A paper describes a structure:
In the presence of BSH and SAM, our results show that CtNmbA and PpNmbA catalyze the methylation of BSH. Our findings suggest that NmbA acts as a selective N-directed MTase of the cysteine moiety of BSH, catalyzing the last step of N-Me-BSH biosynthesis.
Overall, the structure of NmbA is organized into two domains, dominated by the canonical Class I MT Rossmann-like core domain. Across this core domain, six structural elements equivalent to the highly conserved Motifs I-VI are identified, confirming that NmbA is a SAM-binding enzyme. The active site is wedged between the Rossmann-like fold and the substrate-binding domain, with the SAM binding site located on the lower side of the cleft. The variable substrate-binding domain consists of a twisted β-sheet of four antiparallel strands, acting as a cap enclosing the active site. The Cap domain encloses the active site to form a narrow molecular basket, consequently forming a different overall structure and a tighter active site than predicted by the ab initio AlphaFold (AF) 3 model of CtNmbA. The N-terminal β'1 is directly followed by β'2, which proceeds on to α1. β'3-β′4 make up the second segment of the Cap domain (together with α'1 and an unmodelled region of 24 amino acids), following β5 of the 7BS sheet, and continuing to α5 of the C-terminal part of the protein. This Cap domain assembly results in a contorted and non-continuous four-stranded β-sheet of two subdivided segments, β'1-β′2 and β'3-β′4, where only the middle section of the β'1 and β'3 strands is connected through hydrogen bonds. The Cap domains could be rebuilt to avoid clashing between the two monomers and with a good fit to the electron density, except for residues 170–193, which did not show any electron density. PDBePISA was used to confirm that NmbA is a biological monomer, despite having two monomers in the asymmetric unit, since analysis of the protein interfaces did not reveal any specific interactions that could result in the formation of a stable quaternary structure.
Numbering used by the authors: 13 to 169, 194 to 265
Write the structure that this text describes.
């Protein structure tokens, strides 16, 4: 199975999103993040990246391929075990975490924290999203980066339902349906700017195209931790 789909349902409207393995969306996203943030994978000791929602494990593995120290976090044990197998099969070293973003804790800190492919805003209230932002800020090294990949709301025409369904080889079904708090660009900026971050760029796609509110498919914000005396 190379193809997977996301489905967005509002009350009257509907949007389908197509994802193919051969598109290499994960690598192109990682390449854009590395280029725009200036993170050098060749640097020693290697910088540390936390993929706070690895999903199947495609983009976290893409980070790890460049030589970065990658920790992958997801609530689904199946999706984590999928990422172990792929990393094991490619001889790639990765750490794995199964923590909720509202209470996620680590002993170490990170240089980059990546929340990619519309994995933000699943919670009951808006306050829980501000808590997660504050949590991510406390896990970053000084000058650390936070990359937030949100859908651009124009592409859906405050809560929409996002539905994903996966099938194992034998046919076993895995259902991933969520509520998604939909943030305008202003709201996404206000969320990060008042969370301790400074937004450095916004891009409209995984190739780095400029974000246009009225036309872009993606709203990927790349933010950097403000300085503290």
């Amino acid at each position: 199975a190379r193809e997977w789909f996301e489905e967005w349902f509002d009350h009257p409207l509907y949007l389908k999103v197509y994802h193919h393995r051969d598109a290499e969306e994960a690598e192109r996203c990682v390449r854009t993040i590395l280029d725009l943030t200036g993170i050098d994978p060749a640097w020693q000791p290697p910088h540390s990246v936390l993929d706070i929602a690895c999903g199947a494990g495609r983009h976290a593995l893409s980070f790890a391929r460049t030589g970065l120290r990658v920790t992958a976090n997801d609530l689904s044990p199946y999706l984590l075990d999928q990422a172990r197998k792929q990393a094991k099969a490619e001889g790639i070293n990765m750490e794995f975490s199964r923590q909720d973003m509202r209470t996620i804790r680590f002993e170490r800190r990170f240089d980059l924290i990546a929340q990619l492919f519309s994995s933000f805003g699943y919670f009951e209230t808006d306050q829980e999203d501000r808590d997660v932002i504050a949590n991510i800020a406390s896990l970053l090294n000084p000058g650390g980066w936070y990359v937030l990949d949100l859908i651009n709301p124009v592409q859906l025409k405050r809560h929409v339902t996002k539905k994903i369904t996966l099938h194992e080889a034998n046919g076993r079904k895995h259902s991933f349906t969520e509520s998604v708090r939909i943030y305008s660009p202003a709201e996404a900026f206000s969320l990060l700017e008042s969370g301790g971050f400074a937004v450095e760029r916004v891009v409209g796609d995984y190739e780095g195209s400029p974000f246009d509110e009225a036309t872009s498919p993606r709203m990927m914000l790349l933010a950097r931790l403000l300085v503290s005396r």
